[PDB]
Amino acid sequence: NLYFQGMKRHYIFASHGSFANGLLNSVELILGKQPDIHTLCAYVEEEVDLTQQVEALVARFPAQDELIVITDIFAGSVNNEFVRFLSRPHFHLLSGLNLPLIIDLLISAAEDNTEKLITEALTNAKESIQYCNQTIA
Amino acid sequence: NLYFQGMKRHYIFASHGSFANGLLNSVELILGKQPDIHTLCAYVEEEVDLTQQVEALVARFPAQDELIVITDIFAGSVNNEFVRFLSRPHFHLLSGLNLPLIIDLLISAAEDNTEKLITEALTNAKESIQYCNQTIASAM
Helix, strand or coil, rough: CCCCCCCEEEEEEECCCHHHHHHHHHHHHHCCCCCEEEEEEECCCCCCHHHHHHHHHHCCCCCCCEEEEEECCCHHHCCCHHHHHHHHHEEEEECCCCCHHHHHHHCCCCCHHHHHHHHHHHHHHHCCCHHHHHCCC | CCCCCCCCCCEEEEEEEEEEHHHHHHHHHHHHHCCEEEEEECCCCCCCCCCHHHHHHHCCCCCCEEEEEEEEECCCHHHHHHHHHHHHCCCCEEEEECCHHHHHHHHCCCCCCHHHHHHHHHHHHHHHEHHHHHHHHCCC
16 A cells, blocks of 8 residues: 555553543644554443453554554553563554653654664653742753 | 631643543542542633633632642643742642652642652652663563
């Protein structure tokens, strides 16, 4: 169909509850609509098993493409389910979903070195996360 | 009650869009309902303007109580609108809403040194924000 500088990148935001959709909303209010971001909101329907939810979603993506998952929190059930995919080729797992993180990743998307992209974004994100009473003073 | 022993701590999650509500959802699935977290979700309604939305919400909290505001992003318009309140007593502005931060704050909620609470929570939150392909690999 199309061609890519490196691989096609897909993004998954994954959270307990509706955080993932709400953060997508923030992103779209700033950087416009984002077709390659997909959300997983866990335990908003008691019938749905989380392993099936996560495994089914990951299995849908082409193995030749890059999958960048950003979860709500490291210690938690959502992250824990994606840890199995760390040995799947071109799979990238980040924990601690937040806005500066996502903005930096999307603005910097022309970077084809994925490890560079992700670590620079995490770093920029952590710098931006701050106590303003101290940093505006 | 107009007077009491101790201090009341109130939290505001403030975001572009519905992020603030979605994050409160996460928190409540983990730690139960949070009666003292209030959310401000900006630009969901064409009608209402931000400066009034913001000033009206903050004006609700007595000066004697602590207000901890956590916004989605530094230098964004939502954070910007709250910068003016650093002249309020007992007012604290954090930028960069995220789940680990909120969980750490709520765990340490008995903490009376508010500076220590916020700085420690921010440090512990930042440690938790990580590239798992590298951190899990190292532990393995």
